[PDB]
């Protein structure tokens, strides 16, 4: 179980002087999703190439999914999977786009009905609001739940804006049977935001059971 953030560990939005829009675009409407697809190519040893078409509304037809190691890529290379993640158009090597993790086995992973997960949001130690996200997967990546949670917060609580964020710090915590892990929601200090390096935290393809996962979001103000 990952230790909770220590004092001063979380990234402070005030120490990031670049455009927060670069963070915001990762969690806006434009996300990559595909159902029951099998990898067609391999750029490197730890990535998989998929033929995901969203050419009607999206603007990327081939996507490279990068994993933490060779074992993850081997596990899903010849299997039909579902893909869900936030895409980094910035630059990889491989129009085209890239992402990290967000891959789950398709067979046997669907529920009949959408399952609701209640997100509990805290601000400065006191709970702010609670809201539901939905998934129809028995096993869901933390990335998909993280995207759904932040997409709601962007649309409804202005979590990220074009210039800044109204919140100084933020981390999202997933709890599964007294075992927990968390992600920092704020960009690293500096005047540039490296989208690819940030999204790399998803490359472990971490999965949780949608039945009993609990999501908590902790925010602080300036």
């Amino acid at each position, epitope marked *: 179980s990952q230790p909770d953030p220590k004092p001063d560990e979380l990234h402070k939005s005030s120490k990031f002087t670049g455009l927060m829009e670069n963070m915001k675009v990762l969690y806006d409407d434009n996300h990559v999703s595909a159902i029951n697809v099998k990898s067609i190519d391999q750029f490197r040893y730890f990535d998989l190439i998929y033929s995901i078409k969203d050419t009607k509304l999206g603007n990327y037809d081939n996507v490279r999914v990068e994993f933490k190691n060779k074992d993850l890529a081997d596990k899903y290379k010849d299997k039909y999977v579902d893909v869900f993640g936030a895409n980094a158009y910035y630059q990889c090597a491989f129009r085209k786009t890239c992402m990290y993790g967000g891959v789950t086995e398709h067979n046997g992973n669907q529920l009949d009905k959408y399952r609701s997960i209640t997100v509990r949001v805290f*601000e*400065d130690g*006191k709970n*702010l*609001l*609670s809201f*539901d*996200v939905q998934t129809n997967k028995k096993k869901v990546t933390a990335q998909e739940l993280d995207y759904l949670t932040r997409h709601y917060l962007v649309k409804n609580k202005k979590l990220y804006e074009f210039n800044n964020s109204p919140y100084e710090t933020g981390y999202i915590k997933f709890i599964e049977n007294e075992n927990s892990f968390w992600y920092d929601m704020m960009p690293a200090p500096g005047d540039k935001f490296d989208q690819s390096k940030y999204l790399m935290m998803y490359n472990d393809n971490k999965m949780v059971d949608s039945k009993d996962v609990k999501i908590e979001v902790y925010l602080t103000t300036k």
Partner: antibody
Amino acid sequence: EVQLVESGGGVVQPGKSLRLSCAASGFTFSNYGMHWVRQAPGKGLEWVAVISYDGSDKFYADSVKGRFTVSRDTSKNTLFLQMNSLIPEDTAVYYCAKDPYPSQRAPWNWVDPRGQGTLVTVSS
Amino acid sequence: QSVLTQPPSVSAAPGQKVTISCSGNSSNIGQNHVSWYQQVPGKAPKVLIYDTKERPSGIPDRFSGSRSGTSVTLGITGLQTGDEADYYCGTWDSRLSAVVFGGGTKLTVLG
């Protein structure tokens, strides 16, 4: 712009029943939970009930539990409050209020009343 | 009487500033963010503050909110005659599974 219009109030004998309606417009009704709040003449605000956006949660004030029921119809965009065994202490102006954000669950730390309310008077 | 506690009344001259306190339990205010509502005499209540400090659109920055432990405070500066109203604090109570209001504070702008 969001509009809430309460209706159905009137003079009622004690022990009788009355049904209130709140017609909603200007937002996707089924995405938002809804609240009822009342105010007796010259007294403070008192929260009555909430129904969640999907209707699965219904919570009531202790003073109305077992007598009032919140219901909801998506097709006519209407919130209802069925009031049974009315007592003179139920005399109040009743306001409906919408959840600020979609898909909310407890805690509801604020509500957004937008109507003029409807007056119900329970007197013999 | 009332689950949340606020003073019955407060008053000051136009242009002055006032504060209205609101105190509760570990079950409501020590747990949750608080909202404020103003009700001009004879009119309907409307949201004035939410998330303990945020203002809805149309509410000027003369109105502010703050928190100190198990109590919260609403601040009004540059008092105007139109500010004369009843003010209510509100929040969720997890013990009662209800939103609870204070008893209300009557603000008079002294004329």
